[PDB]
Amino acid sequence: VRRFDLLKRILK
16 A cells, blocks of 8 residues: 555665
């Protein structure tokens, strides 16, 4: 819920 690509963002 607006989540899990946003940890595929923390690796960037």
